[PDB]
């Protein structure tokens, strides 16, 4: 009852705009679903009663994966339930799924649940959006309705190119520093059979420690991630300085 009118207040799923192919567009905002907090069935039902008036005709989905992590995951039994709850034609009438800000965790999630996602592998309907600009090749600018919090991450960025993320295998990344977050963008990585740019987002609020190792290397300790991220770049001094600045700004602003 009253607990269901609450999901519509969360707006994890909302209609907004029309594509350049003349179809209604729907947004799923992954980070707004917290597993264990909302009844899965409720969310699904809300998505159904949102698509009901439209899913007989063609339509498009924008999946905003910005900052999606474990806390936003679909549990195994919930995941598979998504592929059976709808009428067969509702699945068929999706002409495009635009995937925005896919990240390392979702990629891992994709490989862990390889079995249930097999049909999505190499599917032509999944369009991973390289950067915020390429969404226009499918949706008029004035038509784009990503959450404002997603769009905020795209402005006044200090960009450090050609950094190296140190791991079993070192990976080439860009490190971008914005006023509220660090974004670590990776070169083509495989997700569900496609090559895609990943964008890992670390808000100032979750950056627990920053440590300069060498003049060429530093670490970030991220809240609830155990193992520090390690980067290499010739301008580490400056990267670290700008991240400290952002963390400090977040700190000074906290109520008490």
Curated annotation (Swiss-Prot):
Residues 1-158 form the CRAL-TRIO domain. Stimulates the GTPase activity of Ras. NF1 shows greater affinity for Ras GAP, but lower specific activity. May be a regulator of Ras activity. It comes from the Eukaryota. Binds phospholipids via its C-terminal CRAL-TRIO domain. Binds primarily glycerophospholipids with monounsaturated C18:1 and/or C16:1 fatty acid moieties and a phosphatidylethanolamine or phosphatidylcholine headgroup. Has lesser affinity for lipids containing phosphatidylserine and phosphatidylinositol. It is found in: Nucleus; Nucleus, Nucleolus; Cell membrane. Changing residue 111 to A: Reduces phospholipid binding. Ubiquitinated by RNF7/RBX2, leading to its degradation. It is linked to Neurofibromatosis 1: A disease characterized by patches of skin pigmentation (cafe-au-lait spots), Lisch nodules of the iris, tumors in the peripheral nervous system and fibromatous skin tumors. Individuals with the disorder have increased susceptibility to the development of benign and malignant tumors. Detected in brain, peripheral nerve, lung, colon and muscle. The chain holds residues 1581 to 1837 of 2839 of the full protein. Interacts with HTR6. Interacts with SPRED2. Residues 1-256 are annotated as: Lipid binding. This is Neurofibromin. The lineage of its organism: Eukaryota, Metazoa, Chordata, Craniata, Vertebrata.
């Amino acid at each position: 009852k009253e607990e269901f009118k609450a999901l519509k207040t969360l707006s994890i799923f909302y209609q907004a705009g029309t594509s350049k192919a003349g179809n209604p567009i729907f947004y799923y905002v992954a980070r707004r679903f917290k597993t264990g907090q909302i009844n899965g069935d409720l969310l699904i039902y809300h998505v159904l009663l949102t698509l009901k008036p439209y899913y007989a005709k063609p339509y498009e989905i924008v999946v905003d994966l910005t900052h999606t992590g474990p806390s936003n995951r679909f549990k195994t039994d919930f995941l598979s339930k998504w592929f059976v709850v709808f009428p067969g034609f509702a699945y068929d009438n999706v002409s495009a799924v635009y995937i925005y800000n896919c990240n390392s965790w979702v990629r891992e999630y994709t490989k862990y649940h390889e079995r249930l996602l097999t049909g999505l592998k190499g599917s032509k309907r999944l369009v991973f959006i390289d950067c915020p600009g390429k969404l226009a090749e499918h949706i008029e600018h004035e038509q784009q309705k990503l959450p404002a919090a997603t769009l905020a991450l795209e402005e006044d960025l200090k960009v450090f190119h050609n950094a190296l993320k140190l791991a079993h295998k070192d990976t080439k990344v860009s490190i971008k520093v914005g006023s509220t977050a660090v974004q670590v963008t990776s070169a083509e990585r495989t997700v569900l059979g496609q090559s895609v740019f990943l964008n890992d987002i670390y808000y100032a609020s979750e950056i627990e420690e920053i440590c300069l190792v060498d003049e060429n290397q530093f670490t970030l300790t991220i809240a609830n991630q155990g193992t520090p991220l390690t980067f290499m770049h010739q301008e580490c001094e400056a990267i670290v300085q700008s991240i400290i600045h952002i963390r400090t700004r977040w700190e000074l602003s906290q109520p008490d």
